Amino acid sequence: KNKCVNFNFNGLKGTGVLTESNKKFLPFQQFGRDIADTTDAVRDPQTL
Amino acid sequence: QCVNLTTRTQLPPAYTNSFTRGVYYPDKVFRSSVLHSTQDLFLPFFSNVTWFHVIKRFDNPVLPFNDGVYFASIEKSNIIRGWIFGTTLDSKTQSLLIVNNATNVVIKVCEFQFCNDPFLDMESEFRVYSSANNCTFEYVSQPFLMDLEGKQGNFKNLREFVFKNIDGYFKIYSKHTPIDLPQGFSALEPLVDLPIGINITRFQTLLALHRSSSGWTAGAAAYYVGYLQPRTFLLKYNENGTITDAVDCAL
């Protein structure tokens, strides 16, 4: 947490930092996107 | 089995209208405070849905699948136990059956023998099916507890299901909220996705009976079956990620 690093999450790639999400999300949700076709939220499959 | 009872008769297709309802999440993608435009099979705004009722008679026509399935039901004691999903409606092909005993929902694809209007008491099979063979597919859902006994007062159960088949994938969109002409706007959530991959051209319904062959007396319930149509909606998302408003593109 709180470091700019490379991401590999389930085949998807990105670069950024990890902060705690306070928004209420679906329990069946794998990921979510932004205003473009770009990411914000990922799910860690081992520990949720 | 082959003997038609009192509740099997020819009745006319009375209809009703719907305005707000029929809006589901097209995907699991979270979008916040934006208007998303997507194209999927949707229930159209200002449409005609076919109204069904049961009081000495029961409505079970054989309805084709290919215009889509929209289900909504306003009930007390949860009369509808599931559906029959098939093509030629015999043992020559595969058929899907949903059995809800209000413990664990049994979902199987197997070769069954079908009647015109199958009955349920506990459960009775057959009339639903007499015998079965040649299936490797079994599915076990999550256990729960519901009340099948009768209740009083206001109508406490609203079950809204959207059933569709896209590229051999069967999806169940489930929403339950407390509530002949309903109102209110809601957003449906997905539940069970099974990649079965069968051709379903027609569908039927199921009925649970009670007794204080023909001595089993049906209860009082109402539901309606809608159709879908490739359209475009605009979905209004809040900060919590729910749909508070839906605007059709062309109506």
Side-chain angles (χ1 to χ4, degrees), chain B residues 12-17 48-52 61 63 223-227:
Chain B
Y15 62 95
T16 185
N17 291 283
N48 290 283
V49 289
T50 303
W51 179 254
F52 291 149
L63 296 175
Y223 63 96
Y224 60 94
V225 175
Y227 295 140

Side-chain angles (χ1 to χ4, degrees), chain B:
Chain B
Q1 293 177 336
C2 296
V3 176
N4 291 337
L5 270 72
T6 307
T7 59
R8 295 182 183 175
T9 185
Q10 185 174 355
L11 306 160
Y15 62 95
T16 185
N17 291 283
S18 178
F19 183 75
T20 57
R21 299 184 179 275
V23 178
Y24 58 92
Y25 296 141
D27 50 349
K28 294 176 178 178
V29 174
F30 176 76
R31 293 178 179 87
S32 178
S33 296
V34 292
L35 296 174
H36 183 62
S37 178
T38 186
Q39 186 174 355
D40 200 5
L41 296 175
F42 290 149
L43 175 64
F45 293 156
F46 184 72
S47 64
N48 290 283
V49 289
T50 303
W51 179 254
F52 291 149
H53 60 282
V54 51
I55 296 171
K56 294 176 179 177
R57 64 184 182 273
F58 176 73
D59 291 343
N60 191 30
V62 182
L63 296 175
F65 183 79
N66 291 336
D67 289 344
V69 176
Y70 175 73
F71 181 78
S73 179
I74 299 105
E75 284 175 349
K76 292 177 176 177
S77 62
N78 294 283
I79 301 298
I80 301 300
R81 301 289 294 274
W83 292 270
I84 291 173
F85 292 153
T87 303
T88 60
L89 296 175
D90 53 350
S91 64
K92 293 177 179 177
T93 186
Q94 295 298 319
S95 295
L96 173 56
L97 177 64
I98 296 171
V99 176
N100 199 343
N101 56 343
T103 59
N104 198 342
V105 175
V106 176
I107 296 171
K108 291 177 179 177
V109 177
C110 197
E111 294 177 350
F112 293 151
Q113 185 63 59
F114 288 146
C115 297
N116 291 337
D117 192 8
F119 292 151
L120 290 173
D121 290 344
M122 295 300 294
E123 69 274 2
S124 178
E125 310 111 331
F126 76 83
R127 273 189 181 86
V128 176
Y129 61 94
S130 296
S131 63
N133 45 30
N134 198 31
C135 48
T136 59
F137 179 75
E138 291 178 350
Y139 177 74
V140 176
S141 63
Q142 295 298 319
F144 56 91
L145 178 63
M146 290 178 181
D147 193 9
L148 295 175
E149 296 298 318
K151 293 176 179 177
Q152 295 298 319
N154 290 337
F155 295 149
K156 294 177 179 178
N157 290 283
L158 174 62
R159 294 175 298 180
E160 296 177 353
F161 291 151
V162 172
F163 294 151
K164 64 181 179 181
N165 199 344
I166 295 170
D167 290 344
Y169 298 138
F170 179 76
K171 294 176 179 177
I172 295 171
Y173 297 135
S174 65
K175 180 61 174 172
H176 188 276
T177 181
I179 185 169
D180 290 344
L181 182 63
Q183 63 180 19
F185 182 77
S186 178
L188 274 69
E189 294 177 350
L191 183 63
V192 173
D193 191 8
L194 292 175
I196 297 171
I198 59 172
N199 197 342
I200 298 167
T201 60
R202 285 174 298 179
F203 60 95
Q204 292 177 336
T205 54
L206 295 176
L207 175 61
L209 300 173
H210 58 81
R211 183 181 64 195
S212 64
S213 63
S214 63
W216 292 89
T217 303
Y223 63 96
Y224 60 94
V225 175
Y227 295 140
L228 302 177
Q229 254 171 20
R231 293 195 182 269
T232 301
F233 287 168
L234 296 174
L235 300 177
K236 183 178 179 180
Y237 296 134
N238 59 342
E239 294 177 350
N240 291 336
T242 58
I243 297 172
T244 59
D245 193 8
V247 175
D248 194 8
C249 185
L251 176 62

